[PDB]
Design a protein around this ligand. Structure first.
Ligand SMILES: [Zn+2]
Length: 253
DNA sequence: GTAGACCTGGACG
DNA sequence: GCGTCCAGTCTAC
C-alpha cells in the first residue's frame, strides 16, 4: 500500500507506545487476543511495506502487519459503510488493541508472529539513509526497470503508483532493461523516485489531492493515448502498468 | 482452485 | 457537483 502509507500508520501507532493493552478484539483467527491484553506496547517500527509492533513488560513478542488494498490503521476511530453495495455492510477490523484512553484498529491486513523486526532504512525509499548505490546496482541488471523498482529489498515502500509515475517522469519505458539504460538515465530515475515519494507525502500531510500524470490516465500530459498492460510474475500484485509509448520509447539493445 | 468485494481517492462521462 | 468505475487481504464456492 506504498511506503508513505506505512509512515502514516507508524505515526498513528506512535502515541500508544508504552501503554498497557487492556482488551483485544477483532475477527482475526491466528492471533490469540490473550497474548496481548495487559502487556505494554513497548515498541513500534516501520520498514518498507511492513509494520512491526513489540509487546512485553521490559525481547518480547513481535506482531508483523502486511496490509491489503483496503488495509488501514485507525486511531480511536472505526470505518463505516457510506452506501449500499451493488448487490450497507460495515467493515470488520481484524485486530483492535484497546488502551485505557484510546485504541488502534487494524483492517484488511495479514498479521503474524515473528522473531522480531527487520527495519533497516538503507533499503527504504523515504528514509534519509536510502542507499542509492545499492539501488543503482539493482537497477542496472538486465531486467526491465519496472520489475526492479518493485523489489522491496532495494526500494522498500515503492508500490504501483510510484512505479508508474516515476517511469513517466524519467521518460523511461517500463520494459526497458536496466542494462540498456545510460547511467544518467538511472540517476534521473532514482532522483524521481525520491522526489515523487516525498512530494506525495507532502500532499498527504495536507489534504491536497495527488493528481496522476500517467497512472490510471487515458492521456498523458502531452495529449497522447496511454497504454495499459500487465507484466511480471503471476504472483505479483503490481503487474498493471501505464505508459505513453511516445514519451517513454523503449530503449533498445 | 477460481471470482470478486473491498467504504474509497482519483478520473472519467 | 453527480454518477460510475476500479485498483493485498479476505471471503464464497
Ligand atoms: Zn506522451
Amino acid at each position: 500500500p506504498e511506503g508513505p502509507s506505512l509512515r502514516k500508520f507508524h505515526q498513528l501507532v506512535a502515541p500508544f507506545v508504552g501503554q498497557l493493552v487492556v482488551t483485544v478484539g477483532g475477527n482475526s483467527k491466528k492471533i490469540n487476543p490473550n497474548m496481548l491484553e495487559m502487556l505494554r506496547l513497548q515498541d513500534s517500527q516501520v520498514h518498507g511495506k511492513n509494520l512491526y509492533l513489540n509487546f512485553g513488560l521490559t525481547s518480547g513478542l513481535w506482531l508483523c502487519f502486511h496490509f491489503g488494498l483496503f488495509g488501514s490503521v485507525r486511531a480511536s476511530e472505526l470505518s463505516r459503510a457510506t452506501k449500499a453495495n451493488k448487490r450497507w455492510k460495515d467493515p470488520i477490523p481484524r485486530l483492535v488493541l484497546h488502551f485505557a484512553k484510546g485504541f488502534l484498529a487494524f483492517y484488511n491486513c495479514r498479521i503474524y508472529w515473528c522473531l522480531g523486526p527487520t527495519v533497516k532504512p538503507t533499503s527504504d525509499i523515504l528514509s534519509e539513509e536510502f542507499d542509492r548505490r545499492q539501488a543503482l546496482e539493482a537497477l542496472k541488471q538486465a531486467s526491465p526497470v519496472s520489475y526492479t523498482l518493485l523489489d522491496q529489498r532495494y526500494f522498500a515502500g515503492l508500490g504501483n503508483i510510484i512505479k508508474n509515475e516515476v517511469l513517466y517522469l524519467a521518460r523511461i519505458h517500463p520494459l526497458s532493461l536496466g542494462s540498456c539504460l545510460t547511467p544518467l538515465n538511472l540517476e534521473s530515475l532514482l532522483d524521481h523516485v525520491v522526489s515523487f515519494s516525498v512530494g506525495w507525502l507532502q500532499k498527504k500531510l495536507e489534504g491536497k489531492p495527488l493528481h496522476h500524470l500517467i497512472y490510471q490516465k487515458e492521456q498523458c500530459p502531452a495529449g497522447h493515448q496511454v497504454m495499459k498492460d500487465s507484466f511480471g510474475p503471476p504472483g505479483s500484485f503490481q503487474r498493471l502498468t501505464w505508459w505513453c509509448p511516445h514519451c517513454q520509447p523503449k530503449a533498445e539493445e
